[PDB]
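Late entry, magnesium ion complex.
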Amino acid sequence: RVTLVGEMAYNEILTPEALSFLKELHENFNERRIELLQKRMKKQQKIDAGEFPKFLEETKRIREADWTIAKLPKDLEDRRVEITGPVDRKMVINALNSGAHLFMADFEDSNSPTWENAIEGQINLRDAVKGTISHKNENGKEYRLNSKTAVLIVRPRGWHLEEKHMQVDGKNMSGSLVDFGLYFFHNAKALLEKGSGPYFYLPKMESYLEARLWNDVFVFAQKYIGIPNGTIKATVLLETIHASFEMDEILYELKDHSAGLNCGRWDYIFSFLKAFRNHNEFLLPDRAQVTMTAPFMRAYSLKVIQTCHRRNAPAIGEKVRADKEREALDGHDGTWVAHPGLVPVAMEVFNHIMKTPNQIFRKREEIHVTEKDLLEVPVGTITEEGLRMNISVGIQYIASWLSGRGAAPIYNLMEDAATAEISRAQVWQWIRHEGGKLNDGRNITLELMEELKEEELAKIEREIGKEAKKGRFQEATTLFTNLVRNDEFVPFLTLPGYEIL
Ligand SMILES: [Mg+2]
Ligand SMILES: [Mg+2]
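Prediction complete; structure with ligand written out below:
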C-alpha cells in the first residue's frame, strides 16, 4: 500500500498510472539500494583499517576485454558544452536556451529537495518536453523555449536520499527512483518521437554494483513501457574516490545504456576527504589550491579520458579559460558551466581546440595512471581566508538550501550542495588535525572556528540585511556547527538537512 503524504496540477504528474509504476520500482529495487548503502559502511571499516581502494583482481577480465559501449544517439555525439541548473521553471528555460549542447536538469545537488520542488520540477520538465513551458514576469514578459534547445538530461537524487513524502508500506521511496521514474514515465515516449531519448546523469556512485542497480532499473523501465532495451542513455558522474578504481567496471555494468563519464571537482575532493577522514596524512590545503592540475586530480581526469575513449564513450570535464583549454588539450569531449553567461567562454575554447564533434579517437595511450597516482595527497597551505570562506559559504549555502534554493549565487559563484560539503568537510578536518593550523601558525581550534564564525555571520548580515534573517540563517548556522563539531562525520549534510528542511 502506497501513501502520498505531501501537500498538493500535481495530480497530473502523480496519476494512478505513474504511481503504479513508482510502486513497482520501489518493490523491485529499493531493498537493493538499501543493501548497497550498507555495503558502503562495511567498505568504510575496511578503509579505516588501512585497506585502500584498488584495481579489483576479480574484474580483471572486464578490463582486458575489448568491448565498447553501445552506439550513442546522434544528439549525444557532440557535447562540447553542457550547462547544469535546477528544475526551477525559469532556470530550465534559460539553460535550455543557453546555446549549450546539453542541459543537465538537476533534481540533485543544485536542487533543494522540497516536495514542491520535486513535483513542480517534473511539471516543468514535462512542459519543457511538450514545448508549453513558460515563465511569466509581473512586467508581462513570458520566457519560452527556442525551437531547438540544448538536449535534456536529468540528474536524480543519489542513492542515499529518500523521498519522505511517498511511502510504500510505511517505507520512504527512493529519491533516485522517484526523480528518474516520473521523468521517464511521463517523457520517454515523447522524447523518442522528437528524435531524442530518456537521458540521465547518474550521481555519487561508489561501486560498480551501484552501476548495475541503475542498469537493472533501466531494463525494467523500458520493458514496463515497452520500448527497446538500450534506449535509455546515462552519463555517470565519476565523482567519488571509490569510483576512480572502478571506472571501467561502471561503464561495463551500464554498457548498453551508457553515454560515458563526467569529472568533477568538489564532490570528488569531498569524497576523498570523507573516505580518508581517519587517515592522519590525508590533510588537505585550502580547497581553492586543490585544482585540476593537483597530481591526484590530474591522474583522475586522465584516467577518465583514457577509460572512456577506450570504450568509445565521451569523457566530459583567464584561469577559467586556461582550465577549459587544459581539458580540451587533455582530451575531454566537452565541459560544464553552471550559468548561461559562461557558455560563450566554454564554447570558444572547445570550438578552437575541438573542431571534431568529439575526440573519442584520442586514446591517451602514452599515459599510465597507477593506484598511488590516484591517492596522492595534495600539498598547499591552509589560510585564514580559506577558513573564513569555508565557514561563510557553508552557512550561506545551507541557508539558501533550507529556503528552497539549492542553486546559490555566492560571491558570484553558482554554488550547489557539493560546495557546502567540501566547505563543512574541510572545517571538520582542520579543527581536528594536529596539522590543522593557519598559514600564520594559529591553531585551528573550536574556539577560533567559533570566533571566525561570529565575524563571518556579522559580515553576512551586513551584505544581506537583517530581514534577509528570514533566510533560515539561525538553522543553517546550527546545522553547519553540528556538522563540524560532531566527531562521527555525517556522510552528506543533506541527510540531517532533509529532516529539518
Ligand atoms: Mg556532483
Ligand atoms: Mg587511519
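The CA atoms of residues 421 and 493 lie 7 Å apart. Will revisit in the morning.
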